[PDB]
Structure formats: structure tokens, C-alpha cells
Design a protein around this ligand. Structure first.
Ligand SMILES: [K+]
Ligand SMILES: [K+]
Ligand SMILES: [K+]
Ligand SMILES: [Mg+2]
Ligand SMILES: [Mg+2]
Ligand SMILES: [Mg+2]
Ligand SMILES: [Mg+2]
Ligand SMILES: [Mg+2]
Ligand SMILES: [Mg+2]
Ligand SMILES: [Mg+2]
Ligand SMILES: [Mg+2]
Ligand SMILES: [Mg+2]
Ligand SMILES: [Mg+2]
Ligand SMILES: [Mg+2]
Ligand SMILES: [Mg+2]
Ligand SMILES: [Mg+2]
Ligand SMILES: [Mg+2]
Ligand SMILES: [Mg+2]
Ligand SMILES: [Mg+2]
Ligand SMILES: [Mg+2]
Ligand SMILES: [Mg+2]
Ligand SMILES: [Mg+2]
Ligand SMILES: [Mg+2]
Ligand SMILES: [Mg+2]
Ligand SMILES: [Mg+2]
Ligand SMILES: [Mg+2]
Ligand SMILES: [Mg+2]
Ligand SMILES: [Mg+2]
Ligand SMILES: [Mg+2]
Ligand SMILES: [Mg+2]
Ligand SMILES: [Mg+2]
Ligand SMILES: [Mg+2]
Ligand SMILES: [Mg+2]
Ligand SMILES: [Mg+2]
Ligand SMILES: [Mg+2]
Ligand SMILES: [Mg+2]
Ligand SMILES: [Mg+2]
Ligand SMILES: [Mg+2]
Ligand SMILES: [Mg+2]
Ligand SMILES: [Mg+2]
Ligand SMILES: [Mg+2]
Ligand SMILES: [Mg+2]
Ligand SMILES: [Mg+2]
Ligand SMILES: [Mg+2]
Ligand SMILES: [Mg+2]
Ligand SMILES: [Mg+2]
Ligand SMILES: [Mg+2]
Ligand SMILES: [Mg+2]
Ligand SMILES: [Mg+2]
Ligand SMILES: [Mg+2]
Ligand SMILES: [Mg+2]
Ligand SMILES: [Mg+2]
Ligand SMILES: [Mg+2]
Ligand SMILES: [Mg+2]
Ligand SMILES: [Mg+2]
Ligand SMILES: [Mg+2]
Ligand SMILES: [Mg+2]
Ligand SMILES: [Mg+2]
Ligand SMILES: [Mg+2]
Ligand SMILES: [Mg+2]
Ligand SMILES: [Mg+2]
Ligand SMILES: [Mg+2]
Ligand SMILES: [Mg+2]
Ligand SMILES: [Mg+2]
Ligand SMILES: [Mg+2]
Ligand SMILES: [Mg+2]
Ligand SMILES: [Mg+2]
Ligand SMILES: [Mg+2]
Ligand SMILES: [Mg+2]
Ligand SMILES: [Mg+2]
Ligand SMILES: [Mg+2]
Ligand SMILES: [Mg+2]
Ligand SMILES: [Mg+2]
Ligand SMILES: [Mg+2]
Ligand SMILES: [Mg+2]
Ligand SMILES: [Mg+2]
Ligand SMILES: [Mg+2]
Ligand SMILES: [Mg+2]
Ligand SMILES: [Mg+2]
Ligand SMILES: [Mg+2]
Ligand SMILES: [Mg+2]
Ligand SMILES: [Mg+2]
Ligand SMILES: [Mg+2]
Ligand SMILES: [Mg+2]
Ligand SMILES: [Mg+2]
Ligand SMILES: [Mg+2]
Ligand code: NA
Ligand code: NA
Ligand code: NA
Lengths: 160, 121
RNA sequence: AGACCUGAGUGUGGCAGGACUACCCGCCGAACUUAAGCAUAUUACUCAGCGGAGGAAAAGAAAACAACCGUGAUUCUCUCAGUGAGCGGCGAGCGAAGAGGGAACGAACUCGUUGCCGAAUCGGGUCUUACAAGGCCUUGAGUUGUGGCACAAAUAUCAUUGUGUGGUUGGUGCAGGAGUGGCGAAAUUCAAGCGAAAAGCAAACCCGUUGCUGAAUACAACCCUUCAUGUGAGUAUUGAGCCAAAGAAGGUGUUAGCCCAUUGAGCCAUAAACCUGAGCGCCUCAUGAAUAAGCGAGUAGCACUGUUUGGGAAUGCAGUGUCAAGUUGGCAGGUAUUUGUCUGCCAAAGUUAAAUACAGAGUAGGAAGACCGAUAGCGAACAAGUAGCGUGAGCGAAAGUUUGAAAAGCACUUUGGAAAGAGAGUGAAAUAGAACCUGAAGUCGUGACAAAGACAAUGGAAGUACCUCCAUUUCAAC
RNA sequence: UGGAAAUGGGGUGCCCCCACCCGUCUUGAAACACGGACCAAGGAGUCAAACAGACGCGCAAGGGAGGAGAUAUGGUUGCCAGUACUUCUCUCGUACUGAAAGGGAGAUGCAAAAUGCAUCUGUGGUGUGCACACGUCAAAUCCGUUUGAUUUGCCCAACACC
RNA sequence: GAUGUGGCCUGGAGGUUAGGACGAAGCUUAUGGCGUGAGCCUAAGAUGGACCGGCCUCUAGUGCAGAUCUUGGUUGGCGUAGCAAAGAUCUAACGGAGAUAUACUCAACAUGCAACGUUGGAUACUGGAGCGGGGAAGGAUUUCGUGCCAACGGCACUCGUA
RNA sequence: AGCUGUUCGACUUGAAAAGGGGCAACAGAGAACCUGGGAUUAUAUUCCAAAAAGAAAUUGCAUGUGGGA
RNA sequence: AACGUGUCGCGAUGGAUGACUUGGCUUCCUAUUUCGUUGAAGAACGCAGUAAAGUGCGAUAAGUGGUAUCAAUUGCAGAAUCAUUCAAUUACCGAAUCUUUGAACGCAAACGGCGCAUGGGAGAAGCUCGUGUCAUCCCCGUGCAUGCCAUAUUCUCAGUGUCGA
């Protein structure tokens, strides 16, 4: 809230042949007499400084949220819609792809990786692996360094 | 976690402002296949009087003895890894420890304790 | 003489003062502004000012709501509600409460008074392993009253005896855990070497664990010879493997699961405190169970004034005056009075955890971000509250050291007083040579060329002369 | 098949014609009206709350929270401050009027009771009014029709009188 | 002034699909092509050295010629205005890189100028209310010796309170 | 050498002394040194060493001598 | 001709842009988390072989001690050992040190000043047999502000206060 306004910074008036903008008081410094407090002044306050009580979050009708999930599920059973989203499902046996319950007994990633090859889900997994790269732009400076595609979603009956 | 975490800024700060003892672990090199089988340890921190061979860089394939672990320039000094200055004197060239491989270990009573507790068997 | 009342001196043992102050408690307290003027009002019971605490503070166990089939300390949240409440030059504007759904909650206790006792009390010595909640002593303090018992969650208590409880009586010493600190995991530096195959094509999938193969005989500035020089490091590509309860995001000379560090079970060590049949023994000390009377006085009210409140014949408060009741008493029940009925509660003494705040605070740590990216973001990415300015209160910058992978930071020759120049070297690259990545615009120098009177120059439209490191097309009866 | 022939584009000069300096206030600017040396970087309708209308979406005489809780999650560095689930509540509406005390809306028929009776598949009535259904004319038809008008019935949405 | 635009552009996010050490971003242009335009794309770099494009959706500190706008840099004026109070210096020698510094021709002048410090002479000024000798306030190493001449002493220095 | 009494200083009964503690002058008050030097690159009434170049003046303690107690 | 103008190639001046980011801002969480007369916060001096600033520290001064950890630090130099340790270096913390000040509190203050008590120390004069002792002078420690509370092996007092002898 105080950024760009931490100065005395009074305007000089009209008699002196300068623009009527607040100027930093004092002397003996390169900043003395410099423009201040303005969104157009170097070191000044930005126009309409951002606040934390912006509306960050949204309400969605409970029925409308369930409608969206229902529509997304129905779309996942259409092979042409899955292909149009970018998934490599050209070798999977059936859509929707249903597999037996025994995968929940796996303990080693080696077993799970073998299962993904049997049902031909490994092609979409491989599409994700080849797409890993450094993110373009400023986001890599933040904690968003790497990007990749989505890949298949495996749905289990519980948290086991 | 140690150094590496969800913040790149915090991870890099933890690395480049590391104290001397943290730098020792960061300046580790892999053991040779002969030493890996003997001690069941993947890698060890490099120390003086160790024998290493350069595996990556211009000096790749050059063997020598570690004469200094600078730990301030993040390099190790090898006796046989050097070059000539303009005036004709020989000056050492610094190599990052992760680009070399330890072929002979300088064994002390403290160094045996590290190898014993790092044994994977 | 002496006493005890009042008040001094000194010795002995302690405490206060200052800092912080974001949030919190008490006081004090504006104006700009809005009302399209302005004085009530508003801003605002806000800023500034003066005091005082803590990890929170304050509040808190009904002299409370309600008017119901009733609820039940405090605090906070949604809602009540920007309100058919109310306050207001009834203008601008302002503006709550009960109920209801919830958070929290082992939530309750102490004194005074009244009865019955009465020094059983407190300090100070001394002893018990002990400044014991213990024993003994003590006129020292206290009868101008310290303690004990019983007062609606109640209905005897006080000796006895056995029953057995307290780890919050005090000594003494014995465990487990949590918490801290240290330690502690996998798998290629695999194969192919360099300007041009460490590259591709077989166009969903499969064929393919296969077949096929070079329009780079490269390029280096008018072009034609000839002679030289030129490709940093493989986290790239391709092929073949491997780890994953670990793909996790950092480092390493180019983009890394397998180069390094990380990422897990687990191991070791511990002042006290904390948790554990209120953990478990011993000594010591405590301790449970099987008849009437009162209840807080310059207080509450009331009057005047002032202030505050939505509170309106007055919501709280302050000053002064005046000042109760307790013989069905008193207070509240949101229009003043006088009556009489009802309902709830019992002021004027005190303590108390949590749920809540941290709107410019600190300590020890952590997790992050659809944020900024060196004129931005804190004033401050840097020897920044620094340099500098002002008598002073105060004011207050500019600045990325970003060369390179490594200093390998230009030996040596030659001219020069030197600064430097010319060569020569390092380096993939000095046009990367030390405030050294990239190196824009504007302005300027130089060489080449175009020309051009004085129509300020620029501009528009059409042509033409000359140029063109530009594009496209055509090149046989096409 | 070449330092090439064309066409287009680009550059510079020249000729003939045109051609007042931008931005601004103003009835009126080329103005003897104001701001205007150059370049770089920066620089101004934003966020929140109340209401309304248009448009999108869900549900509909009902719609929807919010706060909070429960457990997938008593889990995970993180993803996960998300997503999934719940509410005898609250709120906006289905009813409005009066200053208040307080009252509180169907139709038809039979009848005129100061709370009248009966029935319940029903626009209270009238005029104007989409579509649709019966026809009826006109024109054009590739002879299947279409494309206009109009009668009658019902009239939807609306509008106007009651 | 209103509105519309499978209208253009910028920083980020969720997706998708690509590119880069055989050279990303940025930058440069008589590099042309496309679009009415905002702009897009290609070519070249005898530029650079590591990231980044397209499309759908989401999002915002999202587009500059001017505000006597802000900050940095530059610029014509311009080698211009000027550097004119306090009278003043001359000479030889020494010192110094600061010279007597030269293709031909050429005896010297007409082709190395102008400027410094010290010492000795000369001349002059201050004229005891002094550019004399000591102190307070203020300043705080400016004092002294040696060395040194990048910056500074608005000309100069070999000198200096540098 | 002791005893009584006595003078004066040290150790243990109480006349009289009203009015707390401090700062404020480097030009007022106060204040015991001043010449010579061949003694410096730079300090000097500040340095000089036995012939102090030297000549003094002043405090505070002591010792001895002289004289009183 | 010369100035001047325009274009292109190459240079200079000038530091924008891009990439880079151990910084900022914002949100959230976890606690045996809250200073000081037992002298704090702040301010001032000083400390390294070499050391201006900054950082750390206090005459034990870029640090003492103790636990871990295991061979450095590093511009140069120095350094017993090449290290179970007693001496590497880092990290943490129980033991210590901690100059002048400052609420600052013996009295003052543009004064590194001046006291009163009580402990010491050094004393080349003097006395004593170079040893002892030591006047004046000098150095160091501790106590010594004001107020308030409690207290006194039951300390010393005051009052034409109230009594009692
Ligand atoms: K108010
Ligand atoms: K269009
Ligand atoms: K400027
Ligand atoms: Mg700012
Ligand atoms: Mg890729
Ligand atoms: Mg970018
Ligand atoms: Mg490992
Ligand atoms: Mg205001
Ligand atoms: Mg007004
Ligand atoms: Mg006005
Ligand atoms: Mg006014
Ligand atoms: Mg305040
Ligand atoms: Mg709390
Ligand atoms: Mg409290
Ligand atoms: Mg309650
Ligand atoms: Mg409402
Ligand atoms: Mg108000
Ligand atoms: Mg409730
Ligand atoms: Mg409630
Ligand atoms: Mg006792
Ligand atoms: Mg009592
Ligand atoms: Mg390698
Ligand atoms: Mg290999
Ligand atoms: Mg290659
Ligand atoms: Mg290579
Ligand atoms: Mg490496
Ligand atoms: Mg990596
Ligand atoms: Mg772990
Ligand atoms: Mg127990
Ligand atoms: Mg009472
Ligand atoms: Mg009263
Ligand atoms: Mg008011
Ligand atoms: Mg009132
Ligand atoms: Mg009143
Ligand atoms: Mg209280
Ligand atoms: Mg997150
Ligand atoms: Mg800058
Ligand atoms: Mg800044
Ligand atoms: Mg700044
Ligand atoms: Mg070379
Ligand atoms: Mg270059
Ligand atoms: Mg470069
Ligand atoms: Mg550069
Ligand atoms: Mg330029
Ligand atoms: Mg040019
Ligand atoms: Mg003209
Ligand atoms: Mg032309
Ligand atoms: Mg004309
Ligand atoms: Mg005008
Ligand atoms: Mg006019
Ligand atoms: Mg005009
Ligand atoms: Mg005119
Ligand atoms: Mg005007
Ligand atoms: Mg909800
Ligand atoms: Mg209605
Ligand atoms: Mg009503
Ligand atoms: Mg942005
Ligand atoms: Mg993309
Ligand atoms: Mg060009
Ligand atoms: Mg051009
Ligand atoms: Mg684009
Ligand atoms: Mg903007
Ligand atoms: Mg601009
Ligand atoms: Mg201007
Ligand atoms: Mg000029
Ligand atoms: Mg002139
Ligand atoms: Mg003049
Ligand atoms: Mg003159
Ligand atoms: Mg002379
Ligand atoms: Mg000559
Ligand atoms: Mg000459
Ligand atoms: Mg004269
Ligand atoms: Mg004269
Ligand atoms: Mg005279
Ligand atoms: Mg004079
Ligand atoms: Mg001098
Ligand atoms: Mg000069
Ligand atoms: Mg005085
Ligand atoms: Mg003076
Ligand atoms: Mg005097
Ligand atoms: Mg004197
Ligand atoms: Mg002198
Ligand atoms: Mg202290
Ligand atoms: Mg003092
Ligand atoms: Mg004092
Ligand atoms: Mg008496
Ligand atoms: Na006990
Ligand atoms: Na324990
Ligand atoms: Na002149």
C-alpha cells in the first residue's frame, strides 16, 4: 500500500517553468526535485494499485458442476472426441477401456509399466514423455519450469 | 528437501550460499566400477590425495591425483590437469567433481567409517 | 520508667523507571472532505497526541434474552440487515439487537457478608537429603481479624477404625515415547566423432528386431585462379539397455530418472520440561468414601450541564447538587406519568482456557504464487537507511562486477617520456580485453555514389533516367 | 541456361501538375491563439460493493447459498488453498394491502342468504390478433403442387375496453 | 457519439501441436511477398549465443507523438559568449621527454611552435588598518619529507592545500 | 626508672552551625618559569642530563639539625 | 568550386532490448516463540600476519569452550599433523569472555573529569636486616540515585498525640 508514495513530494507550483507534479524535497541527491507520486513518474505509484480483496474465487451452481462432469464423462466414451483431444488411442482394445481389478495388487513400477503396454495405453504415455521441455517465457523463472501433455487417466475404485 | 525443493529461488540460494561442510557433499564424484563392487557405494565426496580420471570436458580421459578441493570455486585441482600461461608457467585447471570418477580412495579411519555406514549390502 | 498511636533515620532482602508497540486496553482528539454554498450533521467516537500489557488482549459465569412448547457465562462466524427497526438541516447520510445454522467448550471458581469456630493464620529461624503446603521454636505481624466449615450442582460435621487416593506437598530415582540433533536408499557418463549420416525416409496403427540412402563434390562478399584458415564443452540426435514405494522442480561447460546432490524404511544420541492404568517404586505430607440469619451505599437512582449512541419525553458515561430501598425488597421488560398484575434476574468485590486479532511488530523455522523482473518489484537484487543534503526536526539516491566453460586476464618484439599504437600470443569466439553478454534508437566520422541553383524542407499523383546482394516467370516450333 | 531475357517490387534524382503546421479549445486556426529540439524506456476508465437492463447457462413454483462439518484426505515436500459429499437452517420468490389494530383474492350454475347453496376437464366477457383445421377464389405450374387473398372454428403471445 | 468484427498486437495460465548448437530470443534492412488496414510471413546478417513459434480457451500493471508529462542519454546554438577589478614582468644558466625534433633540394631565416620548475641578476608591487608575525570561532592532517602527474587547481605546470 | 598533677596530637560526651544537590566565563575572578641552544624535514616558556646551557619558583609527604611543648 | 543535402557500406558516441535473477511483493502454516537494574534497545571506540568499507567479535576481540562432522582455508602468506582426538574446516549449543556508554542509578560533563566507604596492588623516600615494611603520589575491584514494599535474633529515635508511672 505504501509503494511509490514514501516521500514528502510536494508540487512546486506554476511560477517555476516546470510541470505541476509533486517533486521530491531536499537536496544533495540526484532524486531531489525529481517527479514523484505519479503513475507516469519514475519511482512513483502505479495506477490503481492491486489489492488482495479482488474476486479471486467463483461460485458455481452445484447442479451445473454435476452437469459438466456428466458431459465430460459422456465425451470420454466417444473415440473420435478422444482422438480430437490429442490422445493416441489407436491401439487400445475398446472405449471405454475397462480392465480387471487385479492391477491394484501391483507393487513394482515394472509390473504397472508392463500392464500399460498390454492394453496399449503406453502410446499416450510415450506422447507425454516426448513432450517434456522447458516452459517458454517467464513461468520457467517461477516454479513452473517443465511442461508436458496430460496422458491417460487411470480411475480406481478407492484410494488403494 | 535438502537444497532441491518446490522453490527454484530457495533451492539455488541453498546451493550457492552453502557452508563449507555442505559443499563437501555437493562436491562428490562417482566411484569406479572396481570400487563400486568392492565398497557397494555409488559415489563419495572427493578429498585431497584421491586419484581421479576426467570423464567429461576437454580433459576427458586424463588421470591424476587430487591436489586441492577448493570448495569456494566449486572445483577440484588435479596434478596432471594443467595448462600454460602467457609467460610460460604452468597453472592448474579446475574441474567440477561430477565430471570425474574416483579410481583410488585415500583411506583414513574417518573415511572408512563413511564407507562402512554408506555400504548398501 | 514504660507503653502504643502517629511519624522519621539507618542496616538487610527485593521491586519500578527504558526498549518494543502490527494486533489489543484506557484516555485525548482534528481538519481536509461530503452535503454541489454552510453552521447541525459527515469524515469520525477516525488521524495526530498521552498512557499500559500479552502471546494475544479485552470479555466472561445473568440485577441476561424473551413473551415461546420457552432459551441459558464470554468470544467469534453466516444470517438477522443497508433493514416497511430506528437516528437525521427526516437533507446528505447514518444504523444495531433477540431468535436460527455453526466454531469453541471436561468451564467453572474466589472473597466480602450471615451463622458456627476462633490464631487452628502469616512471615522469620532451625531440623528432616527439603528457603517442604512437614515438625519444632518465635512477639515478630496479626483479635481495628488471619484462617476453617456450611450456603440451591446444597442439605449436616467431628472425632474413631479399617477401606485407598493424590506423580499439582516436599525429598529421592526409575521407565517408555514424543520432540530435537546426527546418520541413512536405485539405475548408462553405455555405443556411434565430428563442416557435410552423432542425419533421414518408408505419410493413423502394423509392417519396422525390416528395407531404403546423401542436390553440404559446403561456405567464406564484384568474379577467376592459386595459397591459407575455420568448427569449445554432448544435458542434442541415433541405437541398445537399466531403476522407479525414488520422474522431485537444484547442481554440473548445450535440453539429464540412471554424472552429483536430493527423494524412503530405518539406526544412533538425549539437561530440564512435555506425553504415558491422572507412567512406575520408596520416604514424608495431605486427603475422599462407608437453625435460624444475612448476601457488596455518597452505591443505585433523581436534577442540571456536557458528551456519546440507531436508542427516539434521554443508549452508556462524566462533573456538581441531591441522595435510597431492603415488612412480597430491588433491577430489567426500547412513548413520559400515577396506579396494579405478570415475566426474568439479583448491581454497586475478584480470577478464569478455547474458538477471535496481528491493518507498517519481533524469535525459531517451513510451504507457496495465473505477481514484478533492474526507470519494474521494498527507498535499498550492490560496503542502503549507505553516499550526499539540512543548524535542526528530517530528507535521501545512483549503482546487476552479466568477460570467459576455464584467467587461459594478451609472455615476447618494435615505436613512444608515458598513455598507448603496430605486431605476436590465449581462447570456439577479443567486434568476449576487465565495470568487458547482447549492443537498439538518436547524433556524429569516414569511403563510395546520387546529384542539386536561389521556389524552407517534407508530402501527393503520374511518368522517366539510372541502380538494384529483391521476387517471380521463360528459355523450342516452347 | 547466361554476370540473361522479361514482368513486378524496392532506391535515388528529374520533369509537368497538385499540395498552408501538427495536437488542442473554439461559431470560426495555416494563424500575430496555447503545447510542440531529438531518441529510448515509462505514462492515464482500474478493483470492490448495491441496483437495473440486454445477452449466455442451470433449475423452476421453487431457486440458491453462506458459514460450517464430515472423509476420499487421520493422506501426501508438492500436486491437494483444488475436487468430491451434506444441511428440519438462512435468504429471495409462490400475495397483497392498511398509519395501525388487522384483514386477505377461482370459475360456472341456481339464486338474492349482512360468511347463501350445488358442481369442479378449466381461457370471467368483448374487439383486434401467430400457427393449425375446414373450405373458397386468383395467379403460376415441370400438373406432383406453390403463393397470395379470403370464409368459418379455435384462437397462443400481446393490445384495448369492461 | 454508439455498436460490430473466426479483426490486429503484448505479458502470463489451462490445453494441443511444433521448432532450436546444421543456431532460440533480441537486433539490423533499397529482403521481398501477403493483407484496404492494424499487422503477418519469408530472405540476408560478412548479428547473436539458449531458448521458443502456431492454434483453442483463460487472464491482465495489454498498444503512445505531444500532458510547461517522468527518468536517462543526445543535440543545433558553438570552437561561439566569453576566461578584461586587485599595475608586471625581463634575462641567463641549470633541470626536464617536453628539442636546435626535416624525404629530396638545401649555409644559417623563410619547415618543432608555444609553454614549465629552481637559482643568480634586473625591474616592480604590498607600504606596519600589509598578499607581515601570532590567536579565538570554524575547519581537522590542509603541517613535514620523498615520490608522482590519470583525474583536479575553469590557461598551464616538470609545480600543488592534487 | 616508676607515682600524682599537667601541655599538645591520636581513640572513645554534644555546646552552635537556619535556608537540599549541582551546572553556567578557554576575554570577568584565579593561576608556582624564563632566558640560552649547533634542539627538528616538521614541536617547543613542552625537547637539552652531571659542568643537566642553566638559573629559579612552588605544592604534598617525610628525615635529620636548631628551638619550644 | 566550397559549404551544405540525400543514399549505401564500415566505424564512433550512447547503454535501450532480449535472455539471465542468492532480490522484492503477496498469501498460508508450525511453536515448552516475546527484551531490560543479573544493566536492554540504541549510540561510540577497538579487534586480522596482511584489513578502507562491510561482516563477525570485545583487551580471551574476523574469536575461547563443548558437541557433532572429517581435511581444509585460500588474494598472498603462515601452519605440529596429514590426522581417534588432543590444533583442520564447517554446523549447532549447554560452558565462558564481553572496552566507553546508554533507563544509567556516587557527583558531573563539548571534562575519556572529581568523590565518600571498604578491599586489594605497585611503591628507587624514609625507617629495618639487596631482604622486609612503607608516608605523600599512583593504579584496580566492590558498595554508594530516587521512590516504594517487606523486614530488624526484634536496631536507633521524635511529638504541649493518647496514657501510665
Ligand atoms: K461519530
Ligand atoms: K473482413
Ligand atoms: K530529460
Ligand atoms: Mg515503484
Ligand atoms: Mg521438443
Ligand atoms: Mg519471451
Ligand atoms: Mg544415490
Ligand atoms: Mg479524504
Ligand atoms: Mg461543501
Ligand atoms: Mg464543490
Ligand atoms: Mg468551503
Ligand atoms: Mg493513533
Ligand atoms: Mg488463542
Ligand atoms: Mg485476560
Ligand atoms: Mg449466551
Ligand atoms: Mg434482504
Ligand atoms: Mg457514525
Ligand atoms: Mg446459537
Ligand atoms: Mg449465533
Ligand atoms: Mg519451617
Ligand atoms: Mg474471613
Ligand atoms: Mg558425458
Ligand atoms: Mg559412451
Ligand atoms: Mg553433431
Ligand atoms: Mg561439439
Ligand atoms: Mg556433471
Ligand atoms: Mg536437471
Ligand atoms: Mg527421507
Ligand atoms: Mg498413577
Ligand atoms: Mg447483591
Ligand atoms: Mg451517587
Ligand atoms: Mg455523534
Ligand atoms: Mg443523552
Ligand atoms: Mg444527559
Ligand atoms: Mg477479567
Ligand atoms: Mg499450491
Ligand atoms: Mg538502469
Ligand atoms: Mg529500484
Ligand atoms: Mg529507487
Ligand atoms: Mg587459435
Ligand atoms: Mg560481436
Ligand atoms: Mg560476445
Ligand atoms: Mg559488449
Ligand atoms: Mg546508433
Ligand atoms: Mg554514413
Ligand atoms: Mg515548398
Ligand atoms: Mg521515381
Ligand atoms: Mg502551388
Ligand atoms: Mg481558446
Ligand atoms: Mg473566440
Ligand atoms: Mg489547428
Ligand atoms: Mg493574425
Ligand atoms: Mg490556455
Ligand atoms: Mg455450499
Ligand atoms: Mg409479489
Ligand atoms: Mg402486515
Ligand atoms: Mg503483467
Ligand atoms: Mg504452445
Ligand atoms: Mg542493407
Ligand atoms: Mg534506409
Ligand atoms: Mg502471434
Ligand atoms: Mg498501463
Ligand atoms: Mg516512446
Ligand atoms: Mg514539453
Ligand atoms: Mg557541438
Ligand atoms: Mg571569442
Ligand atoms: Mg567580462
Ligand atoms: Mg589583473
Ligand atoms: Mg628568475
Ligand atoms: Mg629551423
Ligand atoms: Mg623551441
Ligand atoms: Mg609602492
Ligand atoms: Mg599604491
Ligand atoms: Mg606606519
Ligand atoms: Mg596583516
Ligand atoms: Mg606543503
Ligand atoms: Mg587547467
Ligand atoms: Mg563551573
Ligand atoms: Mg572560546
Ligand atoms: Mg581569565
Ligand atoms: Mg595555568
Ligand atoms: Mg611551525
Ligand atoms: Mg553493560
Ligand atoms: Mg552518572
Ligand atoms: Mg543522574
Ligand atoms: Mg510524650
Ligand atoms: Na513427588
Ligand atoms: Na526421557
Ligand atoms: Na581576454
Amino acid at each position: 500500500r505504501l509503494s511509490g508514495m514514501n516521500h514528502s513530494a510536494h508540487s512546486w507550483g506554476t511560477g517555476r517553468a516546470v510541470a505541476r507534479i509533486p517533486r521530491i524535497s531536499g537536496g544533495g541527491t540526484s532524486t531531489s526535485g525529481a517527479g514523484a507520486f505519479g503513475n507516469m513518474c519514475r519511482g512513483g505509484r502505479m495506477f490503481a494499485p492491486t489489492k488482495i480483496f479482488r474476486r479471486w474465487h467463483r461460485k458455481i451452481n452445484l447442479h451445473q458442476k454435476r452437469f459438466a462432469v456428466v458431459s465430460a464423462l459422456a465425451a470420454s466414451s466417444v473415440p473420435s472426441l478422444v482422438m480430437s483431444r490429442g490422445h493416441q488411442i489407436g491401439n487400445v482394445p475398446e472405449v471405454p477401456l475397462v480392465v480387471e481389478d487385479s492391477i491394484q495388487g501391483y507393487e513394482k513400477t515394472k509390473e504397472a509399466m508392463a500392464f500399460l503396454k498390454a492394453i496399449a495405453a503406453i502410446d499416450d504415455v510415450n506422447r507425454v514423455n516426448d513432450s517434456r521441455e522447458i516452459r517458454a517465457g517467464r513461468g520457467k523463472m517461477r516454479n513452473r519450469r517443465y511442461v508436458a501433455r496430460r496422458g491417460p487417466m487411470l480411475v480406481m475404485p478407492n484410494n488403494k | 528437501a535438502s537444497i532441491k525443493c518446490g522453490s527454484r529461488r530457495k533451492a539455488r540460494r541453498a546451493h550457492f550460499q552453502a557452508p563449507s561442510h555442505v559443499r563437501r557433499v555437493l562436491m562428490s564424484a562417482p566411484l569406479s566400477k572396481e570400487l563400486r563392487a568392492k565398497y557397494n557405494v555409488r559415489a563419495m565426496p572427493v578429498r585431497k590425495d584421491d586419484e581421479v580420471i576426467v570423464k567429461r570436458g576437454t580433459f576427458k580421459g586424463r588421470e591424476g591425483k587430487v591436489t586441492a578441493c577448493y570448495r569456494l570455486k566449486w572445483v577440484i585441482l588435479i596434478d596432471k590437469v594443467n595448462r600454460e600461461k602467457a609467460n610460460g608457467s604452468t597453472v592448474a585447471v579446475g574441474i567440477h567433481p561430477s565430471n570425474v570418477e574416483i579410481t583410488k580412495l585415500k583411506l583414513t579411519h574417518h573415511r572408512k567409517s563413511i564407507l562402512e555406514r554408506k555400504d548398501r549390502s
